C-alpha cells in the first residue's frame with residue numbers, strides 16, 4: 411500500500427473509511443520507498459500529535475525514514491523551535507494575528523478589488539490563480555511589511571518549494587538561497603519598519619538579541635511567507651470548490667453572513683488540501699492502537715482520516731453548522747506544533763468567501779468537475795486552474 415492515495419482534493423476516497431475501520435494504524439510505503447505508520451482514526455491521530463516523543467524536529471535526522479525529500483535546510487524543520495529558543499515567539503505571533511489594525515480592511519478591499527476585475531473581465535474566471543492565491547500573497551506581504559510588488563516573485567518559488575518528491579530538488583536550493591538573500595536585504599532596508607520583518611529588523615539591533623543569527627531572521631521571513639501563502643491559498647481554493655458543490659449552504663451563508671465563521675470552520679474540517687499525512691518520528695517505543703511503534707520509525711498522521719472519522723464527527727461528509735465540537739478538528743494540527751497562523755488562516759478564508767458570495771452569488775464551475783487538473787507529487791492538493799462562471 412503506497413501513499414498518498416489520490417491527488418484529487420474534491421472528494422475523499424472510499425478507501426479512507428475502509429482503512430480507518432479495518433486498520434486505523436497501517437504500514438504504508440512513502441514515495442521515497444521508506445516504511446511508515448499511517449494513522450487514520452481521530453483517537454490515534456490525536457494521541458500521536460499530543461505525544462512529543464513522536465517528534466517533528468527529528469524527522470530531519472540523518473538516515474531517518476522519509477515521507478519525502480527535504481526542500482529546505484534541515485534546521486528549518488525545527489523553525490518554530492528555534493524561534494522559541496531565540497525568544498522571538500511572542501513577537502512573531504503578535505505580528506501574524508488578523509487583529510492587527512487595518513489588516514481585515516486590507517483583506518476586504520483586496521478581495522473586492524480582485525473580484526471586481528474578474529467581473530470586469532467577464533466569465534470564465536480562474537478562482538485560484540486570479541483570486542485565492544493573489545489574495546493570500548497580498549495578505550502575507552502586508553503581514554511581513556514587504557512591498558506588494560515583491561509578492562509574485564516570492565510566490566514563484568512555491569510550485570517547487572512545496573513539492574512532495576522522492577529525490578532532492580536542485581531548484582529548491584537555488585530558489586531558497588535567492589529568497590533568503592531577498593529577506594536579508596529587507597532586514598537591512600530602513601524603509602521596512604512595519605509588519606513581521608519590520609519588528610524582526612528592530613529586534614535584530616536590540617541588545618537582548620545580539621546573538622540571534624542573521625540566518626534565522628531571514629529564515630523566519632522566507633518560511634512564514636511560503637508556508638502561509640501556500641496554506642491559505644490552497645485551503646481557500648478547495649473550500650470554494652466545496653461551496654460551489656453546495657448551493658444550499660452558499661445561499662444560507664449569503665443570507666446570514668454571521669454564520670460564515672461556523673461555515674468556514676466546517677470547511678476546514680472537511681478540507682483535503684493536505685496531500686500527505688503529518689510526519690513524526692518515534693523517539694521511543696510507543697504503543698499506538700494494535701501496533702507497538704519502534705523508536706526511529708516514521709509515523710504519518712492522516713488529517714482527513716481524523717476529520718472524517720464518524721466516531722468523532724457524526725455524518726462526517728455533511729457540513730453541519732451546529733456541531734457540539736466545531737473546532738475539535740485537526741485541520742490546524744494539534745499539540746506542540748499547532749498552527750500559529752490559525753486565526754489569520756480563518757480570517758483569510760472568511761473574508762474571501764464573504765466577498766465572493768456578495769459579488770458572485772451564482773458562482774459555479776465553468777467546466778465539468780472531472781476537467782480539473784490536480785497537481786501531482788505536491789504537499790498540497792490543488793487544481794492548476796479553477797474556471798468558474800456566475
Ligand code: HEM
Nearest residue numbers: 490637638641642645688741742743746747749750751755
Ligand atoms: C488555512 C490555513 C492554514 C492551515 C490549514 C494550516 C495548517 C497547519 C498545520 C496542520 C500545521 C501542523 C503541522 C504539523 O504538526 O506537522 C501547521 C503548522 C504551522 N503553520 Fe499553518 N496553516 C495555515 C495557515 C498558516 C499561516 C497563515 C501561517 C503563517 C503566517 C502558518 C504558519 C505555520 C507554521 C510556522 C507552523 C509550524 C508550527 C510549529 O512547528 O510549531 N500557517 N499549519
Ligand SMILES: Nc1cccc(-c2cc(-c3c(-c4ccc(O)cc4)n[nH]c3N)ccc2O)c1
Nearest residue numbers: 480481482483484485578579582583584586587
Ligand atoms: N536541499 C536543499 C534545499 C533547500 C535549501 C538547502 C540549503 C541548505 C544549506 C545547508 C547545508 C548544505 C549546503 C550545501 C550543500 O551542498 C549541502 C548542505 N548544510 N547546512 C545548511 N543549513 C544551506 C543553504 C541552502 O539553500 C538545501
Ligand SMILES: Nc1cccc(-c2cc(-c3c(-c4ccc(O)cc4)n[nH]c3N)ccc2O)c1
Nearest residue numbers: 481482489571572632633634635636637638641
Ligand atoms: N502552514 C503549514 C502547515 C504545515 C507545514 C508548514 C511548513 C512547511 C515547511 C516546508 C517547506 C517550505 C516552507 C516555506 C518556504 O518558503 C519554502 C519551503 N517545504 N516543505 C515543507 N515541509 C516549512 C515550515 C513550515 O512551518 C506550514
